[PDB]
A paper describes a structure:
Our structural study reveals that interactions between the VL6-57-encoded mAbs and RBD are mainly mediated by germline gene encoded residues in HCDR3 and LCDR1, while germline gene encoded LCDR3 residues support HCDR3 in antigen binding. We provide evidence to suggest that the identified class of antibodies constitute a potential immune pressure driving the genesis of S371L/F-S373P-S375F mutations in Omicron variants.
H18 has mild neutralization activity towards wildtype, Alpha, Beta and Delta SARS-CoV-2 authentic viruses, it also possesses activity to trigger conformational change of SARS-CoV-2 S and exhibits inhibition activity in the S-protein-ACE2 interaction mediated cell-cell membrane fusion assay.
Author numbering:
A (entry chain N): 1 to 224
B (entry chain I): 356 to 617, 641 to 649
C (entry chain L), D (entry chain F): 1 to 110, 118 to 220
Write the structure that this text describes.
Amino acid sequence: QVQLQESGPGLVKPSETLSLTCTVSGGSVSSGGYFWSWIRQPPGKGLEWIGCIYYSGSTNYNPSLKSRVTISVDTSKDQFSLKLSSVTAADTAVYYCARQLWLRGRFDYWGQGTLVTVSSASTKGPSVFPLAPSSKSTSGGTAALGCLVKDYFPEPVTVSWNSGALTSGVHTFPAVLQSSGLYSLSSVVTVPSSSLGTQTYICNVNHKPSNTKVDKKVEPKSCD
Amino acid sequence: KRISNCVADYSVLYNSASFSTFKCYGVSPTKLNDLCFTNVYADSFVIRGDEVRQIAPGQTGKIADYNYKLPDDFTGCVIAWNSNNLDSKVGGNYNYLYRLFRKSNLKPFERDISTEIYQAGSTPCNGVEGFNCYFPLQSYGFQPTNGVGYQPYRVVVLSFELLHAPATVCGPKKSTNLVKNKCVNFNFNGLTGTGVLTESNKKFLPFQQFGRDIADTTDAVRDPQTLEILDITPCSFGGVSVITPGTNTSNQVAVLYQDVNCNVFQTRAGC
Amino acid sequence: NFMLTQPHSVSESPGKTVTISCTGSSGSIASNYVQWYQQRPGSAPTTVIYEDNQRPSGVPDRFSGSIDSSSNSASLTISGLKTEDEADYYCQSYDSSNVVFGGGTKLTVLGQPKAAPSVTLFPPSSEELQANKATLVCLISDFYPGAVTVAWKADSSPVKAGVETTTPSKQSNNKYAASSYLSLTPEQWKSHRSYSCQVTHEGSTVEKTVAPT
Amino acid sequence: NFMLTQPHSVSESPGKTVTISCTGSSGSIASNYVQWYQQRPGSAPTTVIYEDNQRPSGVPDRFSGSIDSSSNSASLTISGLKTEDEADYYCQSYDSSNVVFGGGTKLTVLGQPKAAPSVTLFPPSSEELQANKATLVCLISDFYPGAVTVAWKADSSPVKAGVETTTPSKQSNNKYAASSYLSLTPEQWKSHRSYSCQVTHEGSTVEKTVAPT
Ligand SMILES: *[C@@H]1O[C@H](CO)[C@@H](O)[C@H](O)[C@H]1NC(C)=O
């Protein structure tokens, strides 16, 4: 069959130019007389139509989004891209590039939704700190350990344990705003206390907005 | 309007991006180009903006039941658009008419042109002006300064016919890859023959399509692509035969083909 | 100025039949095709029905749509509710060269046993300490109901300044999870003999303590 | 987020019956009382119905209102349309401590005799030239149809910069009136030998000319 893959950064500042490119593999953009469109969806809100394009210069835009959407099609690379101008903090939505044939019809195949979160002021890298387990950090035959993701901007951060090898007992918590602007969260995993000094646990905190990947090993506390 | 002996492309009829409304039932709108029928009937008329909802199979009102009834087996396809800048003018455009009154229901796909002044007593009051006797055809209220629910909309109905005939309005199949020197099946608008297509050396007059022989069999056809003359020859000739040495002598047998061209020996009498 | 009016909340028990409306304000629903979309939380939407009366290959026969052009409300009748139907529903239109979607219907029918609030504590790490920072993390997990109260405690007094906590969030095992963070200076961490976080849930209190060691 | 949906334009011949709708989006139309106000142009609105079925003392009996609560639409029925009925009707709902007025319906009126165009060309005022400004002034009056095209001329060259014209307006004698103004500099007024206003009306052209004297 055919599939659509989006690319470009998931980050943009207020009043900045957005650049999201959706690529197509397994088919041809020009062939089939096939249209192309973009749809965004804010978290917790309904779907919003941005605009639609043909493989020629024909295009149309939402009057709420008129004179701000610039979408172009390049047949040589077999993909289409959308450019957004004067982006604000209210434009935080999950963008879907939409494969659609009938202009009054349906979006029969949907690409995966890239998360776009507008970063006000300046993007701040995360500060990852280990959470050392101890005798007072365990209750029974099981123990807890994790990593602290503190003082980062903006949302989101993806935390994985042992490059995704450990998933059972892993809890990812929603972030909360600190006293001064920045965010903070943590990710922990529950393991038996027997595998504390014999198994190595490394958390992988990724911050695509700040382009920072931090790997922090978790070890039991060393009393000094 | 009747469409015949013409190939139709409906992609250009959709990429206009100017029609306000489009209802097209019976056949899926994305797969009606490949599927084809015999005849296409085009019925064009004007209507107001509030009556476009009435044109559907299974509706009751004052326009559909008296002017053009939609049957249950309606595989037609309805297209309309806004044309207020041309179909209406200042001072009152009353050139278009409609029937409001009728004695009883009418059959679908029937035209009523009886200009007979209607009455509650419809059957006595005929061509005369009597008590409550008002002409069933009344003028419009078209005006270029109205809103959206009363604009002049040009409705065209594109119906299809289901009866036996070769498909004319829509080309059932498009040009496929050309194959020769193999026993294949072809349909060159006049026959369905199974045979090979060799390169002939005889040129046809530039007004003919087919070609016969002394035995009166269509063995020569002109390919409408780029005008090359291709012969037609059947691929199945004769039957099979078995050679048996006989009883109490052998067990193996030899298989002979009568007029089929190909351990294996190519004899003069076949394979 | 044509919009599709869609109910925000629709809740019925599994096994019954429901009706989801999609009402147009200015333009009639019979003017243009209406497409319904069923989307899982955190994934791409999928077309559940199209052309207002016929079903795509892959969805069951229960997803039926009907058009009532008299009231300008498009109906999607869904019968025999089950577990994986619990999703958002959006209706689409076209108007005139401007695709308009619907408001969105959440199909959620709705209640689980009480779970003990397991609480673990960590001291601030040594690596956080040379960066002139300190944070005490309090974690509440595997509990129900999702209503917990946190109160950071210090030798001098319960800590309120710098206290940041998270709302309870549903886990994979149907329980809830919560967090609490206490931003602190390195000098204040060693000022108090020890710090403790107390978690109150359904009257019971679970308390752990940490000390600078 | 509750708003009342009302048709923008409603037209009907006199003596017939017309129905004016008022649809509520979120709240039901029977939740709160709906009031209709018939407002003349350039006049204060006046109450014509109250309590959805009761006519106040003074209005005729034809101002009848009905409530279709199933469709969340408030209906106002008008029978026997007259000339004085050409006013703006606003449906008004209390909502939640916030009066919500409807979009408004203006009943239609259900065209003046032929007249000869007039051209009155005023040269720039001497006092205006003392004020360092020149304004070529051309006027149209007593004409029909109300569609006149003006074209300024500097001796023989057409003038478009600084040209300001007025839309035709009906006079007291059932005719129409219009004006045209050409802003100019004092040096440009005396640079050309003469200025003229050419007025085209139903093909016929009437031209006047001015000169600096
Ligand atoms: C039989 O077919 C082969 C290959 O298709 C060809 O070379 C041969 O000439 C044919 N025999 C005759 C008698 O035409």
